[PDB]
Amino acid sequence: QDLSEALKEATKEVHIRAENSEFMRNFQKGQVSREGFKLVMASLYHIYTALEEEIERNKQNPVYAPLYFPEELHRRAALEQDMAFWYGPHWQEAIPYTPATQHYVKRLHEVGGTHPELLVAHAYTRYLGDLSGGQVLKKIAQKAMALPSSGEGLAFFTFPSIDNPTKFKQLYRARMNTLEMTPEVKHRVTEEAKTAFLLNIELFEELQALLTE
Ligand code: HEM
């Protein structure tokens, strides 16, 4: 069984749970405020910072290297424009760093430092999602929050070096299938992908509590 297929199978059920999180329902219903959006976006800032720092540490390692697409995928410079937009010039000393965000960053550093062969799980989970449901979330954000088509505030959702997200995703899946793959690596990669989804679910449960409690 191809890694891309194995991953899709392993994560299809938790994906259902992820897209039907309370925070995400509210999001999809058009019920998303400036405050909430700022929270989530700050949290993603720390997360992709960690992910991308670990991608860079392992860019020449053959267990990840074929998935190394900084120009097309990396989100950090984008998230920097977005933080400046949402939090202002001094956003670096403004933005929150929640405990669930930290738990996520911490795992990212463990994977990147000790188990680089799983790093694919974490890039899969985030980047492919961004190129799928992220695109739908983007249109909802624009309508709900009156964000202009020029794109300010939504750099995270914008992939100017990818012309066709669908064909790119196909390319990425195919590449995933060229990684050296043993049963031990395949099993563990698909477990880590599930953990990645859970980390995301936990982040959203925490953001939603913060918006109420
Ligand atoms: C309202 C929220 C969401 C919607 C509407 C949504 C929608 C989608 C749709 C329609 C696809 C299929 C596209 C294709 O086959 O190429 C997809 C794939 C994916 N999504 Fe989501 N999604 C949402 C949230 C999430 C979250 C929170 C994550 C991860 C944290 C995520 C990760 C992925 C991944 C990794 C894939 C690729 C599956 C694969 O083709 O192997 N999605 N999503």
What are the domain boundaries of the chain? Answer: 1-213
Q: Which atom of ligand 1 sits closest to the CA of residue 8?
A: 41
- Is the Cβ–Cβ distance between 43 and 202 less than 8 Å? no
Backbone phi and psi for residue 54, each to the nearest 5 degrees, phi listed first = -75, -35
Give the residue carrying structure tokens 């058009």. Answer: 30
Cα-based distances in Å from 107 to 83, 87, 111, 118, 139? 23, 27, 6, 11, 31
Residue 171 and residue 29: Cα distance in Å, rounded? 32
Q: Is 124 annotated as a binding residue?
A: yes
Element (H, E) at 164: none
Pocket of ligand 1 (CB under 6 A): 7-8, 15, 18-19, 24, 28, 124-125, 128-129, 132-133, 136, 169, 197, 200
CB of 138 within 8 A of CB of 27?
Answer: no
Resolution in A: 2.4
Ligand 1: nearest atom to the Cα of 127: 35
Method: X-ray
CATH of 1-213, one of 3.10.20.30, 1.10.1270.20, 3.30.70.100, 1.20.910.10: 1.20.910.10
Question: Residue 36: which of 96, 120, 94 has the closest Cα?
Answer: 96
